[PDB]
C-alpha cells in the first residue's frame, strides 16, 4: 500500500477476542446432569469418561473427567476448568479433581 | 495446475441450485412477505418525520409511493 | 499487444525443437536414445516426403519416370541414417508394379542427385524403393486362389458346473443321511 493509503486506513483492524467455554473466567461451578462415554475420533481408540453439567451461568456443557476412575453421579457439584480434550471433539471443558464432590484419583 | 478448488465450488453451486429448486415455492412466499415488511418500515419511517416536525397530518396531496411492489 | 502464437509457442518448442549447435552422430554418412534424434529424423522424413514427391511427379528425373507419376505411400529413414526406405504406392496389377519397381530403382542415384543439387537436403544417404509387404501378400493370396482348384462341383455355459455342485450337495446329503539416529549415543560418550 502507498503512504497515502496507509494514512487513510491507519492500523489494521483487530477482530475481537471471542470468549470460550468458561466465558473468560478461570473456573465455573456446575451440577452434573448425566454421565456418559464419548468415543475419540480416529486414529485413537478408547471409552473416554465425560459428563454433562449445568454451569453457574445457566448453560449446559460437556466436560471431560480426567484420571483413572471417578465416583461422579447426577446432582453432584464440580468445578470445571478450561482446556480442550484433543481427541474428543466439542469437549472444551474439564473437571477439577479434588474440589467439591469430585475427589482426587485413588492412588494404586 | 489442478482444478481442485474449482471442483469444490462446482459442487457447492450444484447442490445449492438443487436446494433452491426444491424450495422455490417456499422462497417465493418468504420474499413477498419480506417486501411487505420492507414497505411498512418505509411508510412508518416517513410518518415519523412529519409527526416529529409537528404536523398532525401528512403534507397535503402526499401519498407514500409503493416502491417495493410489482410496479414494473 | 495480443499474439495468438504466444499460447502455443512454448509448447511446440519442446516437442518440435531442441537447443544447441549439435548434429547427431547418425546424420553423418558413416546407442542411447535421445529426444533430439526423434526431431532430427522426423523433419527429414517430412522433407524427403515433400522433396521426393517433387521428383516423381515432376520432369527432372526422366521422361518415363515423369510419366510413371509415382505417388508415395510413406518415407522413413533408418535411425542409423545408413540409408532410406522410400515406400511407394502399389497398384493392384502385380506385373506393372514389378516393372515400376525396376524403373524407380534405376533412377535412385539420379533422384538423390536432384535433391542434393537443389540444396533442399545437403547430405542425403542412399535411397531405396520398397513394396509394402501387406500389399504383396494380399496380391499373392489372390494369385494362388485363382490358380487353386476347388475340386469337382449347459453347466459350462452359465459358468458353474451344476453337475459337480450337485455331487457336492448329494455327497453332503449322503453324509447327512527415527529414535536411534539422535545424538544421544554421541553426546553420552559411547564411542
Amino acid at each position: 500500500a502507498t503512504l497515502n493509503q496507509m494514512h487513510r486506513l491507519g492500523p489494521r483492524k483487530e477482530p475481537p477476542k471471542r470468549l470460550g467455554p468458561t466465558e473468560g473466567r478461570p473456573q465455573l461451578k456446575g451440577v452434573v446432569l448425566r454421565t456418559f462415554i464419548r468415543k475419540p475420533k480416529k486414529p485413537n481408540s478408547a471409552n473416554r469418561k465425560c459428563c454433562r453439567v449445568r454451569l453457574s451461568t445457566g448453560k449446559e456443557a460437556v466436560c471431560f473427567i480426567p484420571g483413572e476412575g471417578h465416583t461422579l453421579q447426577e446432582h453432584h457439584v464440580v468445578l470445571v476448568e478450561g482446556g480442550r480434550t484433543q481427541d474428543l471433539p466439542g469437549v472444551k471443558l474439564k473437571v477439577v479433581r479434588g474440589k467439591y464432590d469430585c475427589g482426587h484419583v485413588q492412588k494404586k | 495446475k489442478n482444478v481442485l478448488k474449482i471442483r469444490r465450488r462446482k459442487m457447492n453451486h450444484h447442490k445449492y441450485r438443487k436446494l433452491v429448486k426444491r424450495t422455490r415455492f417456499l422462497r417465493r412466499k418468504v420474499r413477498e412477505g419480506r417486501l411487505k415488511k420492507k414497505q411498512i418500515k418505509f411508510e412508518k419511517d416517513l410518518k415519523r418525520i412529519w409527526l416529529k416536525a409537528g404536523l398532525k397530518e401528512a403534507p397535503e396531496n402526499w401519498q407514500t409511493p409503493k416502491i417495493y411492489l410489482k410496479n414494473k | 499487444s495480443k499474439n495468438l502464437l504466444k499460447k502455443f509457442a512454448s509448447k511446440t518448442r519442446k516437442k518440435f525443437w531442441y537447443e544447441g549447435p549439435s548434429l547427431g552422430s547418425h546424420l553423418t554418412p558413416r546407442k542411447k536414445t535421445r529426444k533430439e534424434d526423434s526431431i532430427r529424423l522426423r523433419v527429414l522424413n517430412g522433407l524427403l516426403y515433400k522433396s521426393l514427391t517433387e521428383l516423381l511427379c515432376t520432369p527432372q528425373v526422366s521422361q518415363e519416370v515423369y510419366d510413371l507419376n509415382v505417388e508415395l505411400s510413406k518415407v522413413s529413414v533408418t535411425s542409423d541414417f545408413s540409408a532410406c526406405r522410400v515406400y511407394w504406392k502399389t497398384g493392384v496389377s502385380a506385373e506393372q508394379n514389378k516393372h515400376t519397381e525396376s524403373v524407380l530403382q534405376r533412377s535412385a542415384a539420379y533422384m538423390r542427385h536432384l535433391l542434393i543439387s537443389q540444396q533442399t537436403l545437403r547430405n542425403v544417404p542412399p535411397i531405396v524403393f520398397v513394396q509394402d509387404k501387406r500389399d504383396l501378400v494380399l496380391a499373392e493370396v489372390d494369385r494362388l486362389l485363382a490358380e487353386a482348384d476347388f475340386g469337382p462341383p449347459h453347466p459350462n455355459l452359465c459358468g458353474i458346473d451344476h453337475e459337480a455342485l450337485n455331487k457336492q450337495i448329494m455327497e453332503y446329503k449322503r453324509k447327512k443321511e527415527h529414535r536411534d539416529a539422535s545424538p544421544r549415543s554421541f553426546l553420552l560418550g559411547e564411542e
Binding site: - | - | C158, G159, I160, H162, L165, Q168, M170, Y172, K173
Partner: protein, 323 residues
Amino acid sequence: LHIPVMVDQVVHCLAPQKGQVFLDMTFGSGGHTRAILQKEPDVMVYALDRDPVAYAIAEQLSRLYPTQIQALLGQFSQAEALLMKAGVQPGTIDGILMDLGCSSMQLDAPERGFSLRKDGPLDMRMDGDRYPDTPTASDVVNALDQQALASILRAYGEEKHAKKIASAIIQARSTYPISRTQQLASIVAGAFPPSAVYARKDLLQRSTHIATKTFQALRIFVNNELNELYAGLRTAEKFLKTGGRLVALSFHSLEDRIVKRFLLGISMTERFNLSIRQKVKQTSVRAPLKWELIHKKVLTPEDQDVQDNPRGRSAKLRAAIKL
C-alpha cells in the same frame, strides 16, 4: 390374483387361429394358456410345467376344453420326450410360449418356500413330489462351501456382495440348520449393518430387501432354470414350424441374455469382458441371422401396470419367427 403379464402382446403376436397347433412350456397357473384359448376356441394347444401342482391345474382346466389343451408334466429338457411320447401331433408347432419365472400360485403359497416375506420351509423348488430327491434350497445353503455358494449368488443372483453374504450363511448354518425362508433372509441381512437391510432401492423407485438376490440365486440354482432354459429354447426351435412365431418373457437379465442371444444368433458360450478395453467400437460372424424378429424391440410393462404386478416389472417380451 396375478393377471398374465403382457399377455395381450403375446396374444397379438401369436395370433392364435383355427387349425394351428401351439405349445406352452410353462403352463403354471394357466393364465396365459387360457388367454390363447379364449381368442380362438378352435385352436390346438399343448401345455407343460415342472410343477405337478401346475399340471393338475391344466388337467382340471382340460375339462373346459377337452382337446384344445393337452396337459403335460416335466422340465424343459424333458419336454422333447414328453412331446415325443405324444407323437407327431404337436409336429410343426405354430408357436411356443416360453414364459419364465415363478408361478403366481407357487410364490403366493408360503409352504412352497419361494417367498422371503412370508414364513415357510426353505423348499424353493418348483418340482413337487414328482422327484423327492431333488435338493431343496435348504440343502443347497447348508451343503455348499463359500466358493460354491458365492458363485450361485454372483452368477445367478447377480449378487454384488457375494463373499460377505456367502460367509454369513456358512457361519449361520453351523450354529443352526437353515430351514426357514425368514431365517435365511435374516442371515443374509446380518452380513451387513442394520442400515442395509431394506436400503437397496430399485429402478422402480421402490425399496426392496437386501436378500432378494439370494432368493433369486437359490431359486434358479435349485431348479437349474437357466441351464434347462437353454435346452427349452433349442427344443422349441426343433419343434417350431417354419414361419412359426416364438414368444418369450424374460423377467431378469440372465434369462433375457439367453433369449436375447439365442434369437439373434449369439451364443451363451460367449466369453465375458470385464470393464477394461471393451471393444464396443474398434477405433465377423460365422453365419447370418436365423430369425425374423417381429418385435426385436423390447419393453417392460407400463409403470402404472407394474404397480399392480411388481413381480413382472422386468418382463421383456422377445418375439421371433423361425427361419
